[PDB]
Every structure is written in structure tokens, then in C-alpha cells.
């Protein structure tokens, strides 16, 4: 729950912190079980139903997909592995075995994830971090399917969840299953969170033309600078908004399920209107503290 002065210091130094056994095995089973039900009732998205042949379509598919993503801030939607489709856009395996991640409002529209997000343990940790008015800006469930579970390239979360000033966005990453060097565990570059961000993702403003694009670019960095952070089920990994982290493709037989959510210190902070994710009247970023 609450961090000791020591762990608190380590976080400031590294930009991330590993807290083994944060959650119990039963809490992990609860998430695993519920996500299983959510996948079972899933409907393949409109843009993923129709296959394509010409760009006239392949393009319209990528557009519907973009719109699907852009308006998922307050929904529970499915995003699939990019390489699980043939060339005409057909699934190579069942869609329910092709899901890369689910988001982005599990924390608000699902009782199990919501309850876990606002638990006693999470609120105290947040308090021990001195968070004033923390709100939940987004949440995701990441599968890391066996054998092709997509890699997540090097990045900083503030690149997508930009604010003013920086240092106001924090990520909570929870291992539902064991994360190892074999199944796509996280890797961090310790101390890489003190020089701001090099890139930012932005969405088209008022004026239709719905879409995303980047400003700046990820500076290639020394791969040897990454340190792996394999953890056992139930571990929580705190992720500073500017720390550089990544995860390799899952080449093992087991998946590497994880539940994540990001908090923003609303106190004296301004959420960039250019972030793809904007709060809706229905779901303005909810408070963490209960
Ligand atoms: O689970 C992963 O491999 C990446 C998740 C991540 O980058 C995040 O929650 O910030
Ligand atoms: Fe991240």
C-alpha cells in the first residue's frame, strides 16, 4: 500500500519501481476470469468484419479502425495483433485468440477492474506518493498472446498522455500472470525519466479529419541500456511518465496478461487537448480517492 522512504527514493532515481506481491493470486484470478467473460461476449469490430482487396477498402478499413480507437477513451474495446491477418484482412486464428489489448475504460465500466483500480492498496500507494487530485485517465488489459504476442517498442507514456507540466502522469502495471524474460516482460532504462520527451502523438483537432500522427521522433537509444524486470503474478510496477520502457515479443507457450491504468495529478496540471484521449461528458477522468 504505502511506500517506504527507501522505495520512494528508488522510484525517483530509476523512474520505475517493482513491488512484488502487491496483489494476491485471487485478485489476479478475478481479473483473468472477468477478462475471459468479456472476450467471450466480444463482437468483432465492424472494420474487422469486412475483408479488403483494393486500397479503396483497405484505406476505409484503416479509417474506421482509427475512429474506433479515437472514441474508445470511455469504452471497453478490442484491439488486435497487427500480424494476425492475411493479406485480404482475414484472421489467421480465431479473433478471441488474436486480441493484443482491451481498453480503454475497463476501470470505469467493469465492476471487477473498477474495484481493483480504486482498492485500498492502490489509494494508499497513491497517497504515499503525495498525489493530490489523482484521476484515472485510461486503463488497458494487455494479453501478450503466446508465440506472437506483439512487442511494444521503446517509448515514454507522456508521449501519448501529454500534460503541462510533465511529471504529472503515472502508470500502474499489474502482472496477472508471471512475466519472464521468455514471455515478454518489461524492460526499462533506469534514470531516463529526467529529460522530458522527444516525441508526442497528436489527434486532428476540431475540423473533422479524424486521425493521429507524431511530432518529433523516438531517438534511437543504446539497447544495452535496458534492464529487464521479470516479475511474479500479483506484482505492481510503478511507471514514471517519462521513463523509457519496452517489452519484447512473446515467443513462449504461455501468455503474459497484465492490467494497467494511468493516473494524472489533476492538481495544477493541464491535460493537453492534442492527446488522442480526451475525457467525455459521460466519463470525465474519475477520481482515484474514494
Ligand atoms: O505490457 C507491456 O508490455 C507494455 C505496457 C506499457 O508500456 C504501459 O502500461 O505503460
Ligand atoms: Fe508504456
From Swiss-Prot:
Sites bearing Phosphothreonine, chain numbering: 54
Keyword Cytoplasm: no
InterPro entries in UniProt: Phytyl_CoA_dOase-like (IPR008775)
Binding site for Fe cation: 155, 157, 245
E.C. number(s) listed in UniProt: 1.14.11.-
Xref: Pfam families: PhyH (PF05721)
Binding site for 2-oxoglutarate: 101, 140, 155-157, 173, 247, 256
Swiss-Prot/TrEMBL cofactor(s): Fe cation
Regulation of this protein's activity per its record: Activity is increased by ascorbate. Inhibited by myristoyl-CoA.
GO MF annotation: an example: 2-oxoglutarate-dependent dioxygenase activity
Keywords recorded for this protein, A-Z: Dioxygenase, Iron, Metal-binding, Oxidoreductase, Phosphoprotein
Gene3D superfamilies: q2cbj1_9rhob like domain (2.60.120.620)
Protein purpose: 2-oxoglutarate(2OG)-dependent dioxygenase that catalyzes the conversion of 2-oxoglutarate to succinate and CO(2) in an iron-dependent manner. However, does not couple 2OG turnover to the hydroxylation of acyl-coenzyme A derivatives, implying that it is not directly involved in phytanoyl coenzyme-A metabolism. Does not show detectable activity towards fatty acid CoA thioesters.
Family label: Belongs to the PhyH family. PHYHD1 subfamily.
Protein name: Phytanoyl-CoA dioxygenase domain-containing protein 1
Organism of this sequence: Homo sapiens
Amino acid at each position: 500500500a504505502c511506500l517506504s522512504p527507501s522505495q520512494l527514493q528508488k522510484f525517483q532515481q530509476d523512474g520505475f519501481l517493482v513491488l512484488e506481491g502487491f496483489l494476491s493470486a485471487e485478485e489476479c484470478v478475478a481479473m483473468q476470469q472477468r477478462i475471459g467473460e468479456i472476450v467471450a461476449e466480444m463482437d468483432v469490430p465492424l472494420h474487422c468484419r469486412t475483408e479488403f482487396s483494393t486500397q479503396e477498402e483497405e484505406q476505409l478499413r484503416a479509417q474506421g479502425s482509427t475512429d474506433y480507437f479515437l472514441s474508445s477513451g470511455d469504452k471497453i474495446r478490442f484491439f488486435f495483433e497487427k500480424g494476425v491477418f492475411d493479406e485480404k484482412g482475414n484472421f489467421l486464428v480465431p479473433p478471441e485468440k488474436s486480441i493484443n489489448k482491451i481498453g480503454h475504460a475497463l476501470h470505469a465500466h467493469d465492476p471487477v477492474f473498477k474495484s481493483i483500480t480504486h482498492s485500498f492498496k492502490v489509494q494508499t500507494l497513491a497517497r504515499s506518493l503525495g498525489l493530490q487530485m489523482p484521476v484515472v485517465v485510461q486503463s488497458m488489459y494487455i494479453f501478450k498472446q503466446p508465440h506472437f504476442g506483439g512487442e511494444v517498442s521503446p517509448h515514454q507514456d507522456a508521449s501519448f498522455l501529454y500534460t503541462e507540466p510533465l511529471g504529472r502522469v503515472l502508470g500502474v502495471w499489474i502482472a496477472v500472470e508471471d512475466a519472464t524474460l521468455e514471455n515478454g516482460c518489461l524492460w526499462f532504462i533506469p534514470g531516463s525519466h529526467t529529460s522530458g520527451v522527444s516525441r508526442r502523438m497528436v489527434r486532428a483537432p476540431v475540423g473533422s479529419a479524424p486521425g493521429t500522427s507524431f511530432l518529433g521522433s523516438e531517438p534511437a537509444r543504446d539497447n544495452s541500456l535496458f534492464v529487464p524486470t521479470p516479475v511474479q503474478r500479483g506484482a505492481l510496477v510503478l511507471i514514471h511518465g517519462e521513463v523509457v520502457h519496452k517489452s519484447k515479443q512473446n515467443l513462449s507457450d504461455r501468455s503474459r496478461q497484465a492490467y494497467t491504468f494511468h493516473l494524472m495529478e489533476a492538481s495544477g496540471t493541464t491535460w493537453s487537448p492534442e492527446n488522442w484521449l480526451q475525457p467525455t461528458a459521460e466519463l470525465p477522468f474519475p477520481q482515484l480517492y474514494t
